[PDB]
Each structure stands twice: as structure tokens, then as C-alpha cells.
């Protein structure tokens, strides 16, 4: 599975939408998720990240590691995503920021 981790807050570009064969993404405010059940491992989402927010559930940094279990929890719970949207607005402004999990909205 791959694991969208904490860059993604607050910018959520949805390039990595368009990309995946299976719709494995689900939607919340400020943040999207994979769905580990669903993800088939195919990498072709993480080149598209512009946050560079996805790795492969294997490959989470250190600091990172909660948002494995925090995809698969809110995944459940967030409706699913098929279409790019545009990008938050001020998501630039966010981009590289370390620290986003604070900002998280449910
Ligand atoms: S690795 Fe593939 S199946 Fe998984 S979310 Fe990404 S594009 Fe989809
Ligand atoms: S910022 Fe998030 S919405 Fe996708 S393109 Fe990157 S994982």
C-alpha cells in the first residue's frame, strides 16, 4: 500500500488521483488518504505528489510512521475521490512546512 503522509495537509493538489488504476484515494478537507486494502502497489501515484507527500508503506520515514495507520483509519471513513480538483488555496504557502498534522481536519 502506499501511504500519503504529512506534506499533503493543507496543499492537496490531487495530481495523484488521475494516475491511480483502481481509485485507492479518499477524500477528506485538507487531506487525502490510500486505502491499503484497495491499493495495489502500482507506484505510479508518487512521481505525481507535487508535495512529494507519498512512499511506499515500507519505504515512511522515521518521523512519519503514524500516517500508515492514519490512512487506513480515516480511508474508511473519508468519501472516495476519482477527479483532480485544483489545490487548496494557499497550498504553496504550506508546501515543505514540517509539522502539518496539527492542522489535520476530519
Ligand atoms: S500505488 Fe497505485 S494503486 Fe496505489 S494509490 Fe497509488 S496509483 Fe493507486
Ligand atoms: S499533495 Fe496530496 S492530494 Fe495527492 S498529489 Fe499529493 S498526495
Known sequence: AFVVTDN???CKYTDCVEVCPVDAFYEGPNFLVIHPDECIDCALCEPECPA???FSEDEVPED???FIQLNAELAEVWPNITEKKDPLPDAEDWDGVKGK???LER
Open 64 to 66: 512519519m510512521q503514524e
Open 101 to 103: 498534522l496539527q492542522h
Open 8 to 10: 499533503c495537509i493543507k
Open 52 to 54: 512529494q507527500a507519498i
